[model samples]
Target: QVDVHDPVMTREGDTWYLFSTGPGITIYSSKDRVNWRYSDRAFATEPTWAKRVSPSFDGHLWAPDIYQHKGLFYLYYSVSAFGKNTSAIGVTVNKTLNPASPDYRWEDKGIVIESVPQRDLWNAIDPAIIADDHGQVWMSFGSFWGGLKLFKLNDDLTRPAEPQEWHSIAKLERSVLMDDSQAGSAQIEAPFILRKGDYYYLFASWGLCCRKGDSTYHLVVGRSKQVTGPYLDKTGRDMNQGGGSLLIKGNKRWVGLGHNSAYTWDGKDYLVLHAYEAADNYLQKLKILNLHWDGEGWPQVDEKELDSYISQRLK
Candidate 1:
């Protein structure tokens, strides 16, 4: 019930792995972060080059973003057809630690990026990775017709060390207080990127996702001292020219929260995505919270501040 798309974080010494994206990759693990133990399936199941290329990529999983570069653990996925504009962005790589032993495989590292129709801006799919503290590796993804893009990865983060194919960064306009009789905001898809203090924020999602109350997912932000942007919004507008700032949306029992990913632990910071649960029509799951950073830094989600870190990690 918890695949809901994009949410990556890894640790090992204190445990907290979590990968996501269903037709493949499903891992979950937690040590004191409130029960979660599935762990296994990032190629332990469907592989054979996805039925030799297409059986609908064999099971249709999209939006995965795991990262661990130098010491191995890659896992950045996407298999197309949210509506079929064609898509791809693959990688597997494990190198082993016996998550469940069986010798723990996972090697598929090919097609590190793809999308056609003249780039459509860059519709490949949602994938995110970061390393820059000066180390460099930034891979952010796209949705709703090439709105958020960023590239430059190769220190083993699988291919594309730079021929710069995708780099747009944000789109979808028409909401300066919605007029013309209102209703125009399907918005850019889910893109998450962060790096505090001197800017480089991003975070995305907006309008109509899933159903019930017809959904209009939310979560927005912008800031840019430059990650490859002119990011701006809070009134200054210009997140590529569509602007942003909201944070989270849809209440009345978590309506359609939106695809999100942002993390931090021992020092606290979070907002793992997914939400809907309005009895049943809201059907989505996975909703971890515990976020905060307002006072001008951005993020602010709160489900009782993630129920006090899931009740202090469920005691």
Candidate 2:
């Protein structure tokens, strides 16, 4: 099976292209979402600007999100100095996901947003971009610090809007015991926004990830009637005040179940994420799950699928 972290997928024609965290951003392709085969990486080498963001960067890119508009595919990703606020979100564009197509080439657009320690409280990692009802594009992103944020993008979608409209959609109280420079224990990141039905649902990962046996990551979500939001949880509490309804957490078989991206294709909804498999020495395996909606419109998934849903990797 493929070793994946923070996996996200985009379908082009009959094939589904999957992207995830790794050196040069690991990739895979599948005809049937399962039984995947190793595909070429998004980048053969790290982006040219990667080292400028963090000198210690080892080329291991983090969470990524993909969105396509007409013939253009925008792949958004994060680069960082592991676990710190020295991070930035960058993007690349491809005309087609199929490598066989003559138009297939990822042209790096460079950093969309960057966060520097002490200067900015928020971490600019794990970007999720969305188009609103009126057709304006916005990005929901961040980690630790002051929590997840939303900001509008210009027409090109390569950078922020000129005036820079922004908002804080989610947050967690930081531990006072840790250094201010450190991320501390707020432990929230990976903000993904899905516009379904009458509401805009905001999904984010809570608790720490990649801690091996102690990884506490899980999924949590909130919703708002508008694109920019108060994003209240089931308790009618605002997410900016640390409110979120638990979506899913780890079971004995799989731990750190998080960093999810949701999409609607044809008439069904699906979730693409990764989890640490305890039986496989805690390797993060790609998880593609059917996202079901409760009567109240919240997302749910059967944990039994964790054991039954195994994806294959050629590599």
Candidate 3:
């Protein structure tokens, strides 16, 4: 499949759930990383209201991330385009793997977050939900124009616990100072936060994304003591300073590589993302790489070991 964005993982018994954005948010299942099959589409058909959101290019669905909490499945998606800050997010009802049964259904919980250009926050996309050690549900989202932002959410996964909170996680310099390619300025997008051992790490895509063969997308990270943080890069630089420790970059296999989700599966952590397949003119395809923690607790995504274990007692 091409253009697979916003990957989310959930395990049911022995199978794994891979949810993403497309004509409509869809789910895929796999027992082994090498094989996968369609599970279900979040919406059986595009909602009638989708056409009303103007901007010639906005319709269907964009980047979407799903999380399973307290036995319910929450799917966060973006609907923003047409030069409008207007956007929406939908949360689904609890689900299971039984597709043949009537129990399988995606009930829209309405827009969870929206942004109007007139408001302080402009543009809302790439939604990811992560729980800190304290069990606080924090969502880190946003893209290009406004960089990235974060907010705390209720445990119900349907409403924000607080108002829209914007965090300056990155900044891009103007084209005059940086390469005028796709990145005239620094940009940090697709923010996915994770807690490894003692520190909470903020992982995001920096530089231009989805320019195909010319894409400069890559993974960068910073860490802070708190989830809602002033995260700092390895050089002790602030993330808002566009200071990030490089994690991954363009490779012969995956040209424009970045925008990812990381999770612990069966005792090992894995980085799941979609990359522009260089061979097919950088066609975006889902890629999963094993992530391991260093002695100091910093997580790394590399090496060729594609096989991952499954824990019967996974959390």
Candidate 4:
């Protein structure tokens, strides 16, 4: 089994692959989604531009979202300091996700976008790729500062689209760029866009995370008719103006949970996320939950599954 943070999953044939935050974008394979075994790191070493972006760059990489477009799989990943605007989102492409296949190899594509301290208002991390109804591709990414950002990507999905169009997809009312006071009181990160039935749902992790014993992380969501627009919560409050419907919250068993990606496979919806276990010193563990839609068309996941669902870290 395996432990994961900021997890994203995709299936190829009978194998389910989980990719997450780690020294080099940790990868794992599973026969069933629950029991996992480590595979390999996408990067055996840091990106060629890693040191240029984050000066003290270790081989460590952050959240990565991988998707298959046309004949290639495009993996978008990030690199940044703990809480600094010194960040960059880079991409890699592979012929296949099946590492055992002779054709499998992740080829680095270099920097797609970056956030410099004084010049940029947003930190570039946690990248997610999605295509609207029109088949125009877009990448949503950001952590803290100005909420989350959405920008179009080129048809190949390696970099931003031509002419450069950007939008403030989501933000919190508490978001004030940054705080010198005490920790990032107003915080948000990990943007994932799921294209469900009639709407595009935007899921974001809100509140402080990665704290030892005091993480306040949880998930919130908003929806829009268009991929990039005024996404509203259940109450019709705009996400760009601090509006997100609570999808799930951590309870007595699990300390906190967020950074989720959702999918509908075999006609059933599933949510893949990581939860910090209080019993295990708040160790982050992989969690997968079933999702159902309410009559109101909002997504729901049972809090009971927080405890019922468990992932085994097998060697």
Candidate 5:
């Protein structure tokens, strides 16, 4: 019943909140993970910094990361133009997500980083944040033009602490036949970082998306022992060298599946994403699945979770 794109989710007690790309970033909430309802938009009016990208880039925000750190809720959102690397990622903090609280207001912290087409090849869109075991904060983001990039954040999590020693994490290869011999293909985007045990897994989406039956979007993942890594796939192939292990792809019912957010509920891990339904004019809908780890620590969708999803739809 809900149509969302570029979704990211976080839970507080019994309720879950979702933020996604749309006019001023649309928000949704759910009590049970199965059903969702529209809640509110992050902005009542377009932000002022949005005009830095372009006069036309009004109200639209892309790929948000929302999580609570040290009693404050931090939301990182992106502003950009389509097919262009002129972009910026900004942060805002709130005391609480609960609208009932008198302190429930988002205080804009300004832009964390900006990428200009002339200066940086990597686009600053599709940002994902992670706090490692050692209490260090990091942000992973990029898309299309230059694959994926990662940066370490200061204790405040507001800006880069050091040399901004940004590292290239993942890159997709392009065929020579393509007119442009660029650094990366149009296949890679939406970088997500997840830490389990000693390994840090980088999950990203590949192939075409948003084109209904023609869309080939799916999820792929790689892992590394270090936070700033030489990430490698299952076959020991370097992700920076165009290596990725396939995690999940669309089925007959759903055309393209990508832009995922991970969460742990009651000690169980889950993934939330959006997909185009084949039977509904390729209408985008919210999808959730239980996430499982193999004996070797690779991720997979739990079949039992799919069965549970089917049962819910039947009702």
Candidate 6:
């Protein structure tokens, strides 16, 4: 019943907001987090600066991250040309998300960071932010080039501040025979970090996506005690050196199930993502699944969904 992509979820009192990739940055709302209804788009008009960086852009924006900080709603979005690294991440803030409120207005804060093809190889798309226990704001972002990256934000959560060092968090492996230009084209992206207990879990999408039945995209994860980390998988393998434990993969009905966002509601953790539905003409639809933590603190999902997938395939 839900259909969305690159979903980021947040709650304001009793209302749950879901932001995702679409023209003007699509949004949805649900009072119970079960049945969702289409909400307003973040922007009424497309940003002019987007065309300057991505000339061929057709008003469709990519991954967006929505979160609330100190009573203000912050929506971070990415603008980029398809298959190119010339991209930027922008932020907008509003005091209230309720469209009916008199104070409802999103003030664009402009570019947080950008990547020029000549200066940087890492694409600045798929942004995910988290506030640490020490009250430090950090962002983890990157896709299909140079792996994943981490940066610290200022106290106000506006942009990158002092100690502006870029930390390499996780990366996929490339063969030695691969070309230098393709060295950073690893199939890992959409980094979301969840801090639970004493460990920070890094979740990322792996393999090819958007390919219908041929799509192999899935979810993988690693964890570390520190925010900026030499994160390790369950087998104690370094994530920076291409080590990641498989979390979930596509099944018969849904293919390329990845690009996830994590949320906790009513003391339970759940994952939201988009997967192609084979029964629905390969259309990408939203999926929510319970995320369970094992005794050793590793995240796991029930086999019911996979079992249902197999049951349908055997019919």
| All candidates: TM-score | 0.32, 0.97, 0.85, 0.95, 0.91, 0.93
Q: Which regions of candidate 2 are displaced past 4 Å? A: 175-179
Q: Give stretches of model 6 more than 4 Å off.
A: 174-184, 306-315
lDDT of 6 by residue, 129-192 (tens): 9777787889899887678899998877778978695789888765545443332558898999
lDDT for each residue of candidate 1 in 93-143, tens digit (9 for 90 to 100): 876534866756788877777765433444677888866667878788877
Identify the runs in model 3 with alpha carbons over 4 angstroms from their true place: 1-3, 47-59, 82-84, 162-167, 173-186, 303-315
Give Cα distance to truth, residue 36, candidate 6, Å. Answer: 1.2
**Which clashing pairs does model 4 show?**
1-312, 1-313, 1-314, 2-313
* lDDT at residue 198 of model 5 (Cα atoms): 84
| Whole-model Cα lDDT of every candidate shown, in order | 0.69, 0.89, 0.69, 0.85, 0.80, 0.82
Kindly indicate the candidate among 1 and 3 with the higher TM-score: 3
**Which residue pairs in candidate 5 have backbone atoms (N, alpha carbon, C) closer than 3 angstroms, thus clashing?**
none
The deviation in Å at residue 126 for candidate 4 is 0.7
lDDT of 3 at 211: 83
> Residues 1-315, candidate 5, lDDT per residue (tens digit)?
577788888887789788888887787777776676677677666567888774568578988999789989888899888767778898888887776679888888878888876466678788899877778788999888668888888777888877676788998765545433233565799988888778998888988888989999999889999978888999999888888899888888888888888877788888877777788898777777978999998999853332245312211
Encode model 4's per-residue lDDT on 213-309: one tens digit a residue.
6888999999999998788999999989889999998877787899888888889999989998888888898889998999988999998888888
Q: lDDT score of model 1?
A: 0.69
Query: What does candidate 2's lDDT look like per residue over 106-142, in tens digits?
Result: 9999999999987777899999998888989999999
RMSD in order of candidates: 18.7, 1.4, 5.1, 1.9, 3.1, 4.0
Poorest stretch of ten by lDDT in candidate 1: 306-315
TM-score of 3: 0.85
- Which candidate leads in TM-score? 2
